[PDB]
Amino acid sequence: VTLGEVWKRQLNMLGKQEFERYKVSDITEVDRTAARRYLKEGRTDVGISVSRGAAKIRWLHERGYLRITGRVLDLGCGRGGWSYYAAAQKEVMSVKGYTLGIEGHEKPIHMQTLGWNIVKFKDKSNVFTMPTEPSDTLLCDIGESSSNPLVERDRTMKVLENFERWKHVNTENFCVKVLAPYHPDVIEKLERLQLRFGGGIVRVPFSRNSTHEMYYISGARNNITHMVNTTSRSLLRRMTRPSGKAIIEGDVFLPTGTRSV
């Protein structure tokens, strides 16, 4: 019914070569060569990012969609790309990252980029069931892809519901993955959240064309339906005319060392 739903149905119809060409068409990618080299080598003294995911938060932060300040919570931190990014930022006082890190899920990677000493990771932590805590900046990058649109809807709704559960009165800043934003139930939920909390939704250019993921953020106000439909139309247009070529950008590099505050 929605254009996003049309997009999702059509993505599954793509043969191998068409899918591979499509997913990278006109997207932005960070060059992960240096980071992969030092990660393989096992170095902790080079200011690399532990994941490709750090590129997404850098973009959101630098483009002004998200202030990162105070006590930061990183829900579903995985390797910790968003946690280390946050820890290096001027106004950040501490970062707490929670993740499952069990049964095939990514474990936090120990690194010594700026502010590593103000980061605390806990694995074996299910953010859907564990007790909440206050934060000034609440990050959540959770949303596992599925070819079943109903599974993506359910996963998205659980993330948005858990976000409202964790969000405290002092949580003025936030960034939450919205895996499948086009689903009418998800649009409705986002609209309700926006009534209470403000903010808006944005497509991060580092996302592959094979996902409709968008981020619900605190730093900009916009029209949810319009922003979602604009991304759906963009994804559909890229499908009709796939370039098969990504724009390459420099990776997220950080200083190394401890911080006092």
Ligand SMILES: Nc1nc2c(ncn2[C@@H]2O[C@H](COP(=O)(O)OP(=O)(O)OP(=O)(O)OC[C@H]3O[C@@H](n4cnc5c(=O)[nH]c(N)nc54)[C@H](O)[C@@H]3O)[C@@H](O)[C@H]2O)c(=O)[nH]1
């Ligand atoms: N290994 C690795 N790669 C990273 C990373 N970051 C970016 N990449 C970049 O991702 C590319 C491969 O795509 P990836 O395997 O990571 O996931 P893709 O988008 O294929 O698929 P996925 O996100 O897992 O699934 C999205 C949806 O696409 C659809 N889909 C997946 N595979 C296929 C397919 O084979 N055919 C069709 N028609 N649809 C598919 C399904 O609907 C699925 O729900 C890499 O070459 C690299 O440039 C990283 O941290 N690790």
Ligand SMILES: C[S@@+](CC[C@H](N)C(=O)[O-])C[C@H]1O[C@@H](n2cnc3c(N)ncnc32)[C@H](O)[C@@H]1O
């Ligand atoms: C997309 S990755 C996060 C990437 C991260 N932002 C980065 O830059 O490295 C999502 C992570 O959330 C974790 N996760 C999924 N469900 C979770 C849950 N219920 N509780 C805690 N972590 C969860 C997954 O294991 C995965 O490692």
